[PDB]
Amino acid sequence: NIILRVNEDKSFLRIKDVAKVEIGAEQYNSTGRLNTSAAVPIIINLQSG
Amino acid sequence: VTANDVINAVNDQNAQYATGKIGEEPVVNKSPQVISITMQGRLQTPQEFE
């Protein structure tokens, strides 16, 4: 419902009209697997020393 | 022209900006390759600042 513009009929153009909003994820670039199934992989790097 | 004008033009036309990738997910129809879009806005030569 964020309003981009007022169309002078007091109709409010909104994001709903020009776009679709959803809660997704910031990057869809990479995934991880454990064996054959999906899992999130947490890689730990050792602090130097 | 005023000096301020020149400053504005150089800011805008001599900068590198951000352009994304083509075919990156979430896409319903899958594309074989993801191809990054590159740009060179920064101007190397003086004949380009002129």
B residues 7..46 contacting A (CB < 8 A): 24-26
Closest of B18, B19, B17, B13 to residue B43, by C-alpha? B13
Q: Mapping DSSP to helix (H, G, I), strand (E, B) and coil, where does residue A22 land?
A: coil
The H or E element that residue A33 is part of is: strand A33-34
Which residues of chain A does B26 touch, with a Cβ-Cβ cutoff of 8 Å?
24, 28
Query: A31: distance to nearest CA of chain B, Å?
Result: 12
Overall resolution, Å? 3.2
Do A41 and A32 contact (CB within 8 A), yes or no?
yes
Rounded Cα distance between B31 and B24, Å, is 8
Query: A45: distance to nearest CA of chain B, Å?
Result: 28
Method: cryo-EM
